[PDB]
Amino acid sequence: TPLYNLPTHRACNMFLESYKAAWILTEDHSFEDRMIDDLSKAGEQEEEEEEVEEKKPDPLHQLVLHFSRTALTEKSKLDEDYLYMAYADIMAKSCHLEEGGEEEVEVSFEEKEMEKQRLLYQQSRLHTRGAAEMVLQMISACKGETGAMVSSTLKLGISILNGGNAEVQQKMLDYLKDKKEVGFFQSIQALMQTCSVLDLNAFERQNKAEGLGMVNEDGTVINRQNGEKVMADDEFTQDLFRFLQLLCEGHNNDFQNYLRTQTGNTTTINIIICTVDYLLRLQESISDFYWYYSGKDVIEEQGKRNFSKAMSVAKQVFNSLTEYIQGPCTGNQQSLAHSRLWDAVVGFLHVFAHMMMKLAQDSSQIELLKELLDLQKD
Amino acid sequence: RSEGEKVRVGDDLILVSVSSERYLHLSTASGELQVDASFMQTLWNMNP
Amino acid sequence: YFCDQELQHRVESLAAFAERYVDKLQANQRSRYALLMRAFTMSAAETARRTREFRSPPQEQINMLLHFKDEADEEDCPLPEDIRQDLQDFHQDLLAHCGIQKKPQSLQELVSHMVVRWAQEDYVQSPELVRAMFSLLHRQYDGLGELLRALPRAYTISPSSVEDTMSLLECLGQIRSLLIVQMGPQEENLMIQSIGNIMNNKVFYQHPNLMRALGMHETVMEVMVNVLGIRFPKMVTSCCRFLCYFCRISRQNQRSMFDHLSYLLENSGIGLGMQGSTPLDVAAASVIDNNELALALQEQDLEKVVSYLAGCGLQSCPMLLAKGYPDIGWNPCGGERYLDFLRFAVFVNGESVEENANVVVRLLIRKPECFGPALRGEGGSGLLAAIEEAIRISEDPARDGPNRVHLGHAIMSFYAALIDLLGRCAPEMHLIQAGKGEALRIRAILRSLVPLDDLVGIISLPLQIPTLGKDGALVQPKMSASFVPDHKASMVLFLDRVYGIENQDFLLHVLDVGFLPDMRAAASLDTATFSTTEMALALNRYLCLAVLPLITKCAPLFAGTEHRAIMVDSMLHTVYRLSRGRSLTKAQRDVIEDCLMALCRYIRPSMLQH
Amino acid sequence: RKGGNARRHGLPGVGVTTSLRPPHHFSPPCFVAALPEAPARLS
Amino acid sequence: GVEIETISPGDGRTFPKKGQTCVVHYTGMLQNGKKFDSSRDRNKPFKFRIGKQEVIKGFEEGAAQMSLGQRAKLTCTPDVAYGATGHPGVIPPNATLIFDVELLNLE
């Protein structure tokens, strides 16, 4: 048990593992902005040929073109590669500088507008170089295969579309309407159907597993347990519906009508109705979770965390459903009126009508109650 | 038809027991055409 | 290559600092340990030491000691200032070497400026070149992340094992070499030899973390993808020989192999690995004796195996009818393989996992054709009828034979596995007392499925005791072809699990029918001529495992037994006879003796006079 | 060794490497030998 | 059996005995005139024990029969080994051999 009687080599292995997890991992370093800037500088090509138009692409442009080429190649599935994973991560963290900014007191209108200008510039640095098309191409190429590839593509698309800027929306709409492809929307439908909900079976299994607490080879605490089985890919499904929201943000009626029906293509996929269906599934899962805790006096810590995950995802779904109709698009308003939205709303009303009292009868659940009321507001 | 979908008038469905976890089955081997909770799944029509 | 050598130099330097630093850390831990044993009167400091540098896993100990990079954390840490500053200096020079911080000065600036200049000069059109320059550019710019990705593969070993790991790496060398080559005869033989040597290597056992870091389980799995994706039965026989032993090596290895459980059950077939080792076997070896993996086992895998079990129950084994055995219409052998896997999934550490048991019984009961001709209304036969027809099959060699495979034995071993699975899916005693609705209903389903009279009948048919035959010789029955006491043990497991023994009249009836004859057979075979007989050993372990351990917990029921007193007398006479140790394991004998004492403390002394 | 030469990387590939590598095996080409399942032929 | 014919005389006095690893460099051909195995081209002489017959048997006999410093052409009849099912890729299964081997610095 003392570390001294352990073998020297094994002690070195423990030191290396814990040093990796405690110093290098936490040692953050920003290079995305510098490296994207260096790739975006065109060099001396314009100096050698001012009078020549249609010049060679910038290094960043060539990079994005390469990824577009691998995306548009014909293949059964998109094989995972860390090259594009790393580069899409870099290109997202370049634009996210103004997203985070780099207790919330008032900000000057000048400062807020200039932050929007910085974000617009950093988004232009990528969407004037084909990134807006490349995210569409890779989403269509993944064909609804959930994985780190579609995750990185969605995160990049959110990074470009943050703030609902209209240039990228226009480029995306023009690309889809011209290529006439159905792979992109079929892929979106498939991913949304493979999004998960509150299971209530993996919950019991994970609760019993964490209550087990045996000593494995990894130590007294089982670090090799499946971390979150009850709500996996929560961050993925939040990013997916965030992407669908940012397509129609700014009340872009053309993209809103495109999401409802895509005239011109041979097959139409009603993303609005599909979103309503996912919402209905989430509503039923939340109702089942509430029934599971209906008899219990106090919801324990794992139950509070799982309600937080499900309710945050429901907040994102509600925001995207709102953004599909905030601009007065009569088509989507009628589609939601005739859809199964009313059943989902009635279920959510019942869940809130009982969950509010259930949490209000206790003080330690005040944070969960605040989040619940926020969801009801949405 | 998927689980979580509304059932309409004149829809065929499989009634599975909660007590015995057994289907509602039409046993006609006896020739009296009896009903029993057995595992040969049997469709049913629920007409208002 | 030069960037790769820079990275290799960095990780090697990190290992060198690791070995320099562990000595200092152990020395400081020695000084604090000596101080703790010198003065431990202060309870607060003693408990703090007993949590930090005592009674904790070494990983947690080193993590807590090494957690000082932040100043607030470093305010209260057991490390000294000299060792602290040494590590901070090393972290600073690691950042300097990674470049964390005209004319190029270092390799990083050189490659970065070179690649950008190449891209600016002209529009490159060779895709391999494009990804080459951008891969190098990403590696140069993000140096720390490359080290982060490299450290999982980094391992440190003692010098005394160096030669053994060199043989290790050589064997893995040809496994990777003929990974890309199509399988042939001499290729197969070469990799059988490499798996044999990979057994022989001692570092295989004494370093499982480096086993994972090298990841030869991934390599051999992909070799499986070749052969399985029917061909090379020797290869399929050598699959479990290494994979399953790798599972047994450590718990984390079993986790790693569990990550691939979907694929093994995806191609799980009786025609795959027909002899000895099997993909079925590696699937089960990934779940043996691990509650966490049993719980994490998702239910669609159980869907796969129940569908395959139904497939076996639908039609007789194609391999068997190719051998020419009589057409049964339902496969016993493959069904019993699948039932063994299901038992390993459901049951663990002498306990029944409730959720696994629930989904297993729900799927099995959902597909009624899984149980076979017996236990189905269309079949119109029960477990009793199944054992009678199975014994007749074993009796006549016309239908038993078509040579080592015997249809009657396979049939009743299949039904024994089915009953053992149901008993291992039986709910727990404390759950049934607390009144869990699902547990009560699962026990009700088992009660409806398996009628009690069938169980007592199957216990009541006895064994075939070995006979002398010719003088000076001992002719023994063929256990591999006939009914063995292992079927009895699995049968009475259902009795002690689902129904229980709560009635004294039922208890004495059970001992009268098929239990006391077994103990009389034990007393008859207690002679040294029949002591080492294999049937006698099977009956012996049957006793010590299933018969008398039931009797120990049925001992309070034995109080007040005046009627049929001489039957209890004969029972205790045979208990004494096997209490005398003749070809008995110490644990077996101790089980018999404890059963005898538990009986003696409830039977009347006025009864015990014989 | 130049005093101010510190904080400069050593040249890649000039240092001492200790990572365990399986050494290369080559069998010299001989054909006049009496050639006699078979062991893995070397390059 | 081989037909050994001397090319250039050597010592003619020290012949290899049974139990000695001799070093020879050679240029082996087929009956057509076919340079395929040339230790001179490879710049690496070849060593062989007499008695173990690690070398082809006809070459072993002719090498025992020649002397140090002397070269001879050994006309090897196909009854020398791999005379049927020969070494793959170099020699067709049934064919003759010749070896203009000289012995140098007999061990």
Side-chain angles (χ1 to χ4, degrees), chain A residues 1-97 100-101 106-378, chain B, chain C residues 1-39 44-45 48 51 53-54 57-59 61-63 65-70 72 77-78 80-81 83-100 104-230 232-469 471-512 514-610, chain D residues 3-4 6-36 38-43, chain E:
Chain A
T1 298
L3 51 98
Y4 94 99
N5 74 357
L6 263 284
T8 305
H9 60 269
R10 179 171 176 180
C12 293
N13 302 348
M14 319 295 257
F15 173 86
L16 282 194
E17 194 282 343
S18 151
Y19 180 82
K20 162 182 175 300
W23 292 51
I24 295 207
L25 249 179
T26 88
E27 183 30 61
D28 82 8
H29 58 292
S30 204
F31 57 94
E32 308 87 355
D33 39 45
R34 180 179 59 236
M35 149 171 177
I36 292 311
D37 165 60
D38 294 1
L39 291 186
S40 68
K41 289 146 40 198
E44 278 64 58
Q45 61 186 60
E46 74 281 356
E47 298 173 57
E48 324 310 319
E49 277 92 61
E50 293 89 359
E51 69 278 352
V52 168
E53 279 98 321
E54 304 177 60
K55 315 153 292 313
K56 58 206 64 176
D58 310 61
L60 181 56
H61 198 333
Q62 306 182 2
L63 164 76
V64 178
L65 284 180
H66 176 268
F67 290 144
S68 302
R69 166 172 193 293
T70 69
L72 296 152
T73 206
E74 188 76 270
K75 189 171 317 309
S76 59
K77 60 181 175 181
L78 185 55
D79 320 72
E80 152 174 339
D81 68 48
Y82 84 110
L83 162 75
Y84 164 75
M85 281 204 11
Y87 269 101
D89 161 10
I90 291 202
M91 285 167 22
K93 293 188 79 284
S94 74
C95 308
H96 278 5
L97 271 206
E106 82 305 345
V107 183
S108 307
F109 160 85
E110 175 184 298
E111 209 166 354
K112 198 168 45 149
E113 211 71 5
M114 235 161 270
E115 289 313 297
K116 300 182 184 302
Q117 294 306 121
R118 296 168 49 81
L119 179 62
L120 285 175
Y121 172 83
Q122 298 173 1
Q123 289 169 354
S124 296
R125 201 145 39 124
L126 300 181
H127 87 257
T128 60
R129 287 183 174 66
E133 287 129 294
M134 156 194 117
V135 285
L136 295 179
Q137 293 173 359
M138 270 175 148
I139 292 171
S140 180
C142 82
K143 296 178 191 62
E145 180 146 280
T146 311
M149 223 54 33
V150 66
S151 175
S152 297
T153 305
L154 285 181
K155 285 179 173 54
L156 178 61
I158 292 171
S159 209
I160 315 292
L161 284 148
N162 256 357
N165 92 79
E167 280 216 300
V168 191
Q169 295 186 359
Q170 194 52 25
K171 295 188 174 187
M172 258 166 217
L173 183 62
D174 292 357
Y175 179 86
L176 298 174
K177 279 184 172 176
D178 159 272
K179 304 306 173 183
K180 297 280 187 53
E181 68 192 331
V182 293
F184 170 79
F185 275 140
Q186 287 170 2
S187 176
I188 291 298
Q189 185 189 5
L191 293 162
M192 254 179 34
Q193 260 156 20
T194 62
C195 292
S196 62
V197 284
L198 260 191
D199 291 289
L200 198 42
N201 297 0
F203 188 36
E204 309 154 327
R205 299 182 173 242
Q206 174 268 359
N207 273 0
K208 186 171 300 301
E210 70 75 22
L212 165 58
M214 284 181 339
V215 180
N216 294 3
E217 183 77 3
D218 58 8
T220 300
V221 49
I222 318 92
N223 299 68
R224 306 190 66 116
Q225 291 193 63
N226 306 70
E228 296 312 89
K229 327 165 211 163
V230 48
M231 201 75 158
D233 293 78
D234 55 299
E235 161 175 329
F236 173 83
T237 175
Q238 289 172 1
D239 287 0
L240 177 62
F241 287 98
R242 175 63 179 179
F243 179 85
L244 298 177
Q245 173 192 125
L246 286 181
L247 285 184
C248 306
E249 251 268 349
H251 317 271
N252 189 242
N253 200 3
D254 299 328
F255 225 141
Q256 295 180 63
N257 289 1
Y258 206 42
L259 289 204
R260 188 213 322 113
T261 53
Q262 319 85 336
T263 173
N265 301 1
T266 167
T267 306
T268 58
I269 298 92
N270 197 349
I271 305 298
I272 323 296
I273 278 186
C274 298
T275 300
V276 166
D277 300 318
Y278 175 80
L279 184 64
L280 187 49
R281 295 168 41 188
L282 189 55
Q283 174 261 301
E284 296 166 359
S285 74
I286 297 186
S287 306
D288 294 358
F289 219 63
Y290 149 74
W291 287 111
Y292 176 86
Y293 279 97
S294 147
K296 253 69 65 187
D297 52 354
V298 177
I299 289 145
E300 61 270 16
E301 197 264 0
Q302 293 105 20
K304 297 171 55 182
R305 186 171 33 256
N306 275 347
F307 271 105
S308 300
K309 282 194 231 282
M311 268 165 17
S312 177
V313 174
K315 168 159 46 191
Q316 183 51 242
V317 174
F318 271 144
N319 287 359
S320 71
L321 267 176
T322 306
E323 210 61 63
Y324 296 150
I325 56 195
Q326 268 205 126
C329 44
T330 326
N332 297 1
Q333 288 190 1
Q334 300 283 317
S335 180
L336 289 200
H338 289 91
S339 186
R340 302 192 62 180
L341 185 58
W342 300 135
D343 304 355
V345 178
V346 170
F348 263 103
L349 285 174
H350 174 275
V351 180
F352 298 146
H354 290 84
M355 272 285 327
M356 288 195 299
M357 321 285 198
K358 160 81 171 306
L359 306 186
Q361 297 178 0
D362 198 295
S363 177
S364 63
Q365 297 158 353
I366 198 44
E367 182 75 40
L368 188 59
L369 186 54
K370 297 177 179 179
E371 194 155 29
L372 183 86
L373 291 173
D374 224 351
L375 177 58
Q376 197 169 356
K377 161 190 175 302
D378 282 337
Chain B
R1 289 299 159 292
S2 304
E3 308 132 302
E5 288 184 2
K6 301 239 281 293
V7 290
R8 73 275 315 145
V9 279
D11 196 299
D12 84 317
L13 61 174
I14 327 175
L15 275 177
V16 178
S17 180
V18 185
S19 208
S20 46
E21 301 175 299
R22 284 182 246 291
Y23 309 85
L24 277 183
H25 164 84
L26 210 29
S27 175
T28 66
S30 292
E32 61 173 301
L33 304 103
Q34 33 164 356
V35 48
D36 52 3
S38 56
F39 296 72
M40 271 275 298
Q41 73 154 10
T42 297
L43 280 311
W44 284 89
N45 296 357
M46 202 175 328
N47 300 357
Chain C
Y1 171 85
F2 291 103
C3 213
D4 190 294
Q5 300 313 299
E6 201 85 61
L7 152 73
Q8 167 165 356
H9 174 89
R10 285 195 286 240
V11 54
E12 282 186 1
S13 185
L14 183 48
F17 197 77
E19 74 89 11
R20 290 183 293 240
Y21 211 77
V22 283
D23 300 356
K24 326 262 182 294
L25 290 179
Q26 294 187 359
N28 181 61
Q29 170 259 356
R30 294 328 313 271
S31 69
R32 304 172 300 118
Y33 203 29
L35 189 140
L36 177 62
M37 291 325 168
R38 172 213 313 294
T51 314
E53 54 85 61
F54 225 130
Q59 172 55 240
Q61 290 174 357
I62 194 43
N63 155 287
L65 196 185
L66 172 60
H67 179 268
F68 53 97
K69 187 186 80 284
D70 159 57
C77 279
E81 185 75 6
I83 317 195
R84 210 154 24 218
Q85 211 295 121
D86 294 355
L87 192 32
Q88 309 264 9
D89 158 57
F90 181 81
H91 193 81
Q92 254 68 250
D93 58 62
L94 186 56
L95 302 176
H97 208 272
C98 302
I100 288 304
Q105 174 83 270
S106 180
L107 177 63
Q108 298 180 300
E109 213 283 337
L110 181 270
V111 194
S112 67
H113 146 66
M114 191 265 288
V115 165
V116 178
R117 188 191 71 238
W118 277 5
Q120 290 166 356
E121 277 184 1
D122 44 5
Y123 179 32
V124 294
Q125 288 189 121
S126 46
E128 287 65 23
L129 176 57
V130 193
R131 43 174 44 244
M133 25 185 302
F134 285 113
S135 182
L136 277 309
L137 187 78
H138 165 263
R139 294 174 55 181
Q140 302 296 167
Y141 259 143
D142 158 48
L144 220 74
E146 223 51 28
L147 189 55
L148 255 184
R149 284 181 271 303
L151 288 183
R153 308 168 191 116
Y155 202 93
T156 302
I157 59 178
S158 62
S160 56
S161 34
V162 159
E163 177 41 66
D164 201 3
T165 88
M166 300 285 327
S167 304
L168 189 41
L169 290 179
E170 146 197 79
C171 301
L172 172 72
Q174 325 73 28
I175 320 166
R176 297 169 172 178
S177 301
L178 316 83
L179 180 53
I180 67 184
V181 179
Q182 189 161 300
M183 293 294 84
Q186 58 161 0
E187 292 68 31
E188 150 208 340
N189 192 4
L190 168 38
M191 84 192 32
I192 302 298
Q193 171 290 327
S194 64
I195 304 204
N197 197 296
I198 216 67
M199 292 325 158
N200 176 3
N201 297 124
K202 177 60 195 175
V203 189
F204 191 20
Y205 332 116
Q206 68 184 123
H207 288 273
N209 296 1
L210 165 158
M211 270 322 83
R212 239 167 296 115
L214 294 179
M216 61 285 278
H217 52 278
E218 300 298 302
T219 306
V220 59
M221 259 289 257
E222 211 155 359
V223 170
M224 301 329 86
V225 201
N226 282 56
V227 279
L228 304 182
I230 196 55
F232 302 90
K234 175 54 195 173
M235 222 49 265
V236 191
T237 279
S238 179
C239 78
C240 196
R241 285 290 309 96
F242 162 85
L243 220 48
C244 301
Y245 194 100
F246 176 82
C247 309
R248 312 260 172 281
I249 285 287
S250 81
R251 206 151 292 296
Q252 318 180 6
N253 300 1
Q254 205 180 358
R255 162 92 269 191
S256 311
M257 281 304 327
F258 184 86
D259 279 57
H260 314 271
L261 199 67
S262 59
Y263 167 75
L264 301 170
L265 296 200
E266 146 71 335
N267 42 35
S268 67
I270 310 309
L272 283 87
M274 304 137 313
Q275 317 279 245
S277 303
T278 320
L280 264 295
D281 201 300
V282 52
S286 181
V287 211
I288 287 304
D289 191 1
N290 219 8
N291 320 299
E292 37 274 52
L293 292 186
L295 267 60
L297 175 58
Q298 273 153 80
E299 162 288 340
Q300 86 301 359
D301 300 62
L302 290 301
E303 297 164 1
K304 305 178 181 184
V305 52
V306 59
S307 307
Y308 301 150
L309 192 297
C312 309
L314 191 271
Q315 169 236 42
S316 179
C317 190
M319 263 265 297
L320 267 280
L321 50 94
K323 292 294 183 180
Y325 283 95
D327 297 358
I328 323 174
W330 76 259
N331 181 7
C333 164
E336 174 280 345
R337 311 318 210 191
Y338 287 139
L339 292 171
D340 285 0
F341 168 79
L342 282 175
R343 292 184 312 117
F344 297 149
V346 166
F347 199 85
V348 63
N349 291 120
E351 229 60 31
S352 301
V353 192
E354 300 86 5
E355 316 77 17
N356 294 121
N358 261 250
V359 287
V360 153
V361 58
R362 272 152 51 171
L363 293 171
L364 283 209
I365 215 62
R366 210 62 54 238
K367 304 301 298 177
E369 81 167 70
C370 295
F371 324 120
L375 297 325
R376 183 209 308 92
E378 181 274 301
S381 301
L383 214 55
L384 262 206
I387 202 192
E388 320 314 334
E389 61 202 291
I391 293 181
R392 308 311 104 73
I393 297 176
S394 79
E395 185 58 61
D396 55 357
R399 281 191 283 80
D400 210 2
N403 41 295
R404 306 174 177 292
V405 175
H406 323 121
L407 306 189
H409 178 267
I411 288 181
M412 81 204 98
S413 69
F414 166 84
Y415 280 92
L418 177 59
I419 289 306
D420 188 294
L421 175 79
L422 300 202
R424 293 192 189 295
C425 294
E428 305 285 305
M429 182 25 49
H430 75 272
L431 288 202
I432 210 65
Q433 297 159 261
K436 242 50 64 179
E438 57 299 5
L440 289 152
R441 290 186 305 120
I442 292 315
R443 204 186 65 177
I445 295 323
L446 264 40
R447 274 151 148 64
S448 176
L449 189 47
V450 199
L452 172 59
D453 36 22
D454 285 2
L455 294 49
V456 278
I458 290 147
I459 316 175
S460 73
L461 315 93
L463 293 319
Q464 34 191 240
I465 281 312
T467 52
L468 193 76
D471 51 0
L474 303 161
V475 61
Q476 59 200 301
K478 192 154 192 172
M479 312 146 299
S480 59
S482 303
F483 174 110
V484 315
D486 263 7
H487 304 99
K488 263 180 175 2
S490 63
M491 263 316 279
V492 303
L493 171 67
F494 194 92
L495 218 38
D496 56 59
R497 257 290 196 177
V498 179
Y499 281 134
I501 301 193
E502 60 184 61
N503 314 118
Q504 181 180 2
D505 189 6
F506 174 83
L507 174 59
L508 281 308
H509 166 38
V510 165
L511 317 153
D512 200 0
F515 264 80
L516 286 208
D518 301 1
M519 329 172 43
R520 294 195 181 70
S524 99
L525 263 41
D526 208 2
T527 89
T529 68
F530 282 143
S531 280
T532 61
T533 304
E534 286 50 53
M535 151 65 88
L537 263 303
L539 193 142
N540 195 36
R541 83 158 58 65
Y542 167 45
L543 297 184
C544 84
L545 270 205
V547 199
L548 311 77
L550 172 60
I551 299 329
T552 70
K553 54 183 177 179
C554 293
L557 199 34
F558 254 116
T561 298
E562 283 298 297
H563 30 60
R564 293 71 61 71
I566 55 179
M567 311 211 341
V568 201
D569 168 63
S570 77
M571 142 179 300
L572 214 29
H573 185 322
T574 61
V575 175
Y576 195 15
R577 284 325 313 149
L578 298 320
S579 173
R580 234 70 179 182
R582 173 68 272 122
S583 183
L584 289 170
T585 308
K586 171 175 297 301
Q588 298 170 354
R589 188 193 317 120
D590 292 358
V591 166
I592 312 315
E593 296 175 356
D594 290 0
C595 174
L596 153 73
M597 300 250 302
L599 286 179
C600 102
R601 69 196 59 242
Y602 288 103
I603 309 301
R604 298 208 155 186
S606 57
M607 220 302 307
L608 304 162
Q609 76 275 359
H610 318 116
Chain D
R7 287 316 188 183
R8 179 153 86 282
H9 304 92
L11 303 186
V14 316
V16 178
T17 166
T18 80
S19 302
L20 290 212
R21 315 296 189 183
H24 296 277
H25 303 276
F26 303 96
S27 177
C30 177
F31 299 84
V32 77
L35 168 71
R41 196 70 188 69
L42 279 70
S43 300
Chain E
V2 315
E3 293 84 4
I4 168 180
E5 303 141 300
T6 172
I7 325 174
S8 174
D11 192 6
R13 174 220 181 280
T14 322
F15 300 91
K17 86 166 185 55
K18 214 193 190 83
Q20 281 178 357
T21 38
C22 326
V23 46
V24 285
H25 77 81
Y26 55 92
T27 309
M29 291 76 98
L30 301 189
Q31 184 274 122
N32 154 18
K34 156 62 169 273
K35 328 74 192 169
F36 74 99
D37 181 355
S38 177
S39 47
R40 259 303 179 121
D41 298 0
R42 306 164 187 179
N43 307 359
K44 298 159 56 180
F46 156 81
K47 267 64 62 180
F48 69 99
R49 192 32 73 90
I50 273 175
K52 312 301 178 180
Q53 295 194 358
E54 58 195 63
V55 62
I56 199 53
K57 42 137 289 182
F59 190 97
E60 168 255 359
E61 295 159 359
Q65 298 176 3
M66 73 204 159
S67 183
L68 85 85
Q70 164 252 310
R71 52 201 319 258
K73 44 182 301 203
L74 311 187
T75 313
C76 299
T77 293
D79 305 302
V80 313
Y82 51 83
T85 285
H87 188 324
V90 289
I91 166 66
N94 180 59
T96 37
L97 281 153
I98 39 170
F99 280 89
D100 75 4
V101 46
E102 80 203 87
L103 171 72
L104 280 188
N105 90 74
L106 172 54
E107 321 294 9

